């Protein structure tokens, strides 16, 4: 609602983050290795952009990502919502 | 002293050997720990990774897999299993602490192993 | 695996004088190297990280420099204590890797 569906966003971009990590190091050639690169990327992923920098390559990587998409999509499907609504109806008063 | 580990160890050819690593300061549910491999007059030879917390390992794919690495989660140390050595495989054993953004910031003293009869 | 390069192999310079170790990659890796310093009998020690940024405790004398596949480690002077092998080491791709290593000499 107001500020849970934000929350859930969180948690699924920081384990998304932090899984990715642990599935695509291992696989020789993935970039996305580090935890700070690993977090911009599930970014990139929970909001559609498709900027082409990082991706995975492992198939758990691409499950982990997967997972993101879902659990993000919806989200910001839903947080975008939230901030319509607010600064909207704000300016309109 | 940050990272921590023995002086020097000798073993037989065939024979196996353990190796450890303990880490006093933090021992983050996030930092990974690695060994590097110094033969005499050579370079950094990168052996594996280990995250002690998660559990998993990863090793070289190049090199002659005879490493197996762990962990002891309630002991903040960690160990390296090699097997079955030859003269080859005489060389410094460091081990080093990398946060997880990419770098070794903490280097342990180095292992001097020494493989004869 | 990503080949780091370094060449020259060795160093030679008079005290004082800026000197800069090159290293160069098999393709692309960013802004992600990352030099060690290495002395006789001691063990590997950062330097710089991320290829410009520095480490808290580091002579000011080291400067990052360089992008792409043209690395620069750089010391801007030089003084006795600085003779080590030099080593650069990636993390833009799985595995890590590391440079064959660069040993600095002085002429006096």
């Known amino acids: 609602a107001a500020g849970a569906a934000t929350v859930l966003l969180v948690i699924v971009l920081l384990a998304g983050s932090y899984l990715a990590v642990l599935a695509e190091r291992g696989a020789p050639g993935a970039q996305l290795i580090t935890y700070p690169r690993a977090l911009w990327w599930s970014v990139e992923t929970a909001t559609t952009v498709g900027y082409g920098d990082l991706y995975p390559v492992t198939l758990w990587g691409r499950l982990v990502a997967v997972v993101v998409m879902v659990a993000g999509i919806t989200s910001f499907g839903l947080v975008t919502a939230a901030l319509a609504t607010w600064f909207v109806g704000r300016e309109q008063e | 002293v940050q990272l921590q580990q023995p002086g020097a160890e000798l073993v037989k050819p065939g024979a196996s050997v353990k190796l450890s690593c303990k880490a006093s300061g933090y021992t983050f549910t996030s930092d990974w720990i690695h060994w590097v491999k110094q033969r005499p007059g050579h370079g950094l030879e990168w052996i594996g990774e280990i995250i002690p917390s998660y559990g998993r390992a990863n090793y070289n794919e190049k090199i002659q897999k005879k490493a197996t690495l762990t962990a002891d989660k309630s002991s903040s140390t960690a160990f390296m299993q090699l097997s079955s050595l030859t003269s080859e495989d005489s060389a410094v054993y460091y081990c080093?602490?990398?946060?997880?953004?990419?770098?070794?910031?903490?280097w342990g003293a180095g292992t001097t192993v020494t493989v004869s009869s | 695996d990503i080949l780091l390069t370094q060449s020259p192999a060795i160093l030679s310079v008079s005290p004082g004088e800026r000197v800069s170790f090159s290293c160069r990659a098999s393709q692309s890796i960013g802004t992600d190297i990352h030099w060690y310093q290495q002395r006789t009998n001691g063990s590997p020690r950062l330097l710089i990280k991320y290829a410009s940024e520095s480490i808290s405790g580091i002579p000011s004398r080291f400067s990052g420099s360089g992008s792409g596949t043209d690395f620069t480690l750089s010391i801007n002077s030089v003084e006795s204590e600085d003779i080590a092998n030099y080593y650069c080491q990636q993390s833009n791709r799985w595995p890590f890797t590391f440079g064959s290593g660069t040993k600095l000499e002085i002429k006096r």
């Open positions: 080093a602490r990398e946060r997880g953004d990419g770098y070794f910031a903490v």
